[PDB]
Design a protein around this ligand. Structure first.
Ligand code: JPC
Length: 548
């Protein structure tokens, strides 16, 4: 019932935390320098704790039972296997939090004796004990945002809850295969984490077009992880158990469910007993899959209870969008409140109350929205974009504080066709790379299921294969997109687009002078920066394929 119980001990940091940069070399233009970026820290952990701690009142109904029945039948169609200890170790990222048992990710990836033996006892313990809660560490996340004076004060840090490295590897052995198959099997096209930007755009355009009179809305659950109940989490296990699994996997899955997923004790970085959790833990293997399926079940049942007409939904964890047949504004709003009231009963109360949308460009899904622009031939071309405030705020931060994994590279790749990536991020970072003289250096970035390594000098080929040549010729963006980008730059205290356009010229010429791949990057990535455009032909793009 209560999402959390606290002892009073503080959520302590592990390393000295930095909340502001000494100098922001992106929010700078000769006579106008600013620094409105900030990073969340332990200091606001108590504030977040207060926010996520509340009573959950859950009451299900026939609409829910029905949808749950359908989902379990769909789940019975899946077969999954145990992952080999070796396979689970190999899936352990290079720097994931070390264990308190004398080893780190390095030792797990190389299968050192100490690590392997420890992992084996943890697995054996899971098979022998299905009751003893597994301890978790709770910590404040350090994430970068931009102050938004109008929308409110700085955001409190998100809280991360995760078990020891040894337990994490065992989770993969028992459930990794399931996480790669179950969501799509029960949700199909509605499973949002299966689409590339072009496919996501296509799904949305298609869903919108099939309605005679389309109406969409995004539903935002206030603190989704805190809203999922113990019942929800055991119900997730019953959905997992519907799959065809080896008895050994079933045992570990039940143990992991009763000892970890359903809840458990939390300790701060100092080892002090911090509290007890009775909701979703942010740092466990099943978080993404669990949230996605549970959000889908509740959302679909709510659609039925509210009488939403012909709903086509897209779900990304707790992020949900529903596009259906409009019944007129008056009726749509009535239907949306019924939907909300149903979601609430299912323990999925709304943060920002949902409102009907009748312009596709204004609907945000999985943090993005569809927009339109013209191709070199003058025809319309759709693409995925998003508010650039946070991506740029972080790009600025990662300019000073070099981090192992860059977010800017990821944003450039995922949003390559956007005007903000093209005029700002590409111009800025290629200028920085030439200044540091590290152009061909391979960098690591993330697309949330992996950490990739790529050389910026390979961006034109990567972008072509990912978004097509049109990514280098898009023009005539919408005023909504232009206004949003311009507003983000103001909030950030960064130079306006007209200034970046001037800068792009120099960056382009500098890249060309260097010849080679650098020249290709210049001619292709910045063809928008010169009045007399170069032609631009297909590249050796037909030589690669991505997973994420
Ligand atoms: C109207 C022309 C001059 N234009 C472009 O050619 C252009 C297209 C794509 C990219 Cl990535 C960059 C540029 Cl400069 C455009 C200039 C714009 C602009 C420039 C400075 C401030 C605000 C908007 S918006 C815009 C467009 O085609 O949509």
């Amino acid at each position: 019932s209560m999402s959390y119980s606290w002892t009073g001990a503080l959520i302590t940091p592990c390393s000295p935390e930095e909340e502001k940069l000494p100098i922001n070399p992106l929010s700078n233009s000769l006579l106008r320098y600013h620094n409105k970026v900030y990073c969340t820290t332990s200091k606001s952990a108590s504030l977040r704790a207060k926010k996520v701690t509340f009573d959950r009142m859950q009451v299900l109904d026939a609409y829910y039972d029905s949808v749950l029945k359908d989902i379990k039948l769909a789940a019975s169609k899946v077969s999954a296997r145990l992952l080999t200890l070796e396979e689970a170790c190999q899936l352990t990222p290079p720097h994931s939090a070390r264990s308190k048992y004398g080893f780190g990710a390095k030792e797990v990836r190389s299968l050192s004796g100490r690590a392997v033996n420890h992992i084996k006892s943890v697995w054996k313990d899971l098979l022998e004990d299905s009751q003893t809660p597994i301890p978790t560490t709770i910590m404040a996340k350090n994430e970068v945002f931009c102050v938004d004076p109008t929308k409110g004060g700085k955001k409190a840090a998100r809280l991360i809850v995760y078990p020891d490295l040894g337990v994490r590897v065992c989770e993969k052995m028992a459930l990794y295969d399931v996480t790669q198959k179950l969501p799509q099997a029960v949700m199909g096209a509605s499973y949002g984490f299966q689409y590339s930007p072009a496919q996501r755009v296509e799904f949305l355009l298609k869903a919108w077009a099939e309605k005679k009179d389309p109406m969409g809305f995004s539903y935002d659950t206030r603190c989704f992880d805190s809203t999922v109940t113990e019942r929800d989490i055991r119900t997730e296990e019953s959905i997992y158990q519907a799959c065809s699994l080896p008895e050994e996997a079933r045992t570990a899955i039940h143990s992991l469910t009763e000892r970890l997923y359903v809840g458990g004790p939390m300790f701060n970085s100092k080892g002090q007993s911090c509290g007890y959790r009775r909701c979703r833990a942010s740092g466990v293997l099943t978080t993404s899959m669990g949230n996605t399926i549970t959000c889908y079940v509740k959302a679909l049942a709510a659609c039925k209870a509210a009488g939403i007409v012909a709903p086509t939904m897209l779900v990304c964890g707790d992020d949900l969008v529903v596009i259906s047949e409009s019944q007129g504004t008056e009726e749509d709003e009535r239907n949306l409140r019924a939907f909300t009231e149903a979601m609430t009963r299912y323990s999925a109360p709304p943060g920002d109350p949902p409102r009907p949308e009748y312009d596709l460009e204004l609907i945000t899904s999985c943090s993005s929205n569809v927009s339109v622009a013209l191709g070199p031939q003058g025809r319309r071309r759709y693409y995925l974009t998003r508010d650039p405030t946070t991506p740029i705020a972080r790009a600025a931060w990662e300019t000073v504080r070099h981090s192992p994994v860059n977010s800017w590279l990821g944003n450039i790749i995922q949003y390559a066709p956007t005007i903000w990536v093209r005029m700002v991020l590409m111009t800025h970072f290629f200028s920085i790379l030439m200044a540091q003289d590290t152009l061909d250096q391979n960098l690591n970035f993330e697309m949330y299921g992996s950490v990739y390594s790529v050389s910026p000098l390979d961006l034109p080929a990567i972008i072509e294969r990912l978004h097509g040549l049109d990514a280098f010729s898009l023009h005539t963006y919408t005023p909504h997109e232009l206004t949003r980008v311009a507003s983000a730059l103001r909030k950030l205290g960064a130079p306006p687009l007209r200034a970046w356009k001037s800068r792009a010229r120099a960056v382009r010429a500098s890249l060309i002078s260097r010849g080679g791949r650098a020249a290709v990057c210049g001619r292709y990535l910045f063809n928008w920066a010169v009045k007399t455009k170069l032609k631009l032909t297909p590249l050796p793009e037909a030589r690669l394929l991505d997973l994420s």
